[PDB]
Amino acid sequence: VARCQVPDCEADISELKGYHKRHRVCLRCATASFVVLDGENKRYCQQCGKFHLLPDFDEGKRSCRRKLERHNNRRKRKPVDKGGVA
């Protein structure tokens, strides 16, 4: 539904052409960076598109800090490769 459903900003983006219309958010919000949501400032996460919590951010880019890394130390080592015997 092309409509900015932001508590502090109830916009009716019925005719938009960008990455804000595909997330129920107006351009003003997409550019505003942060919005005074329900007693909480949310930040448009370009990684997921949806809104996120500002206090849950870090220096590493402007996105959530969850599931940011996983495929890095993926290796299979074997210091034994024989097992016990006695």
Would you tell me which residues interact with Zn ion (CB under 5 A)? Answer: 4, 6, 9, 11, 26, 29, 45, 47-48, 64
| Min dist. Cβ of residue 35 to Zn ion (A) | 7
Per-residue b or e along 37-72, where b marks 16 or more CB atoms closer than 10 Å to that residue's CB: beeeebbbbeeeeebbeeeeeeeeeebbeeeeeeee
Task: Check whether 45 is labelled as a binding-site residue.
Answer: yes
Q: Please name the residue that has the structure tokens 């849950």.
A: 56
Minimum distance from residue 79 beta carbon to Zn ion (Å): 38
Known binding residues for Zn(2+): 4, 9, 26, 29, 45, 48, 52, 64
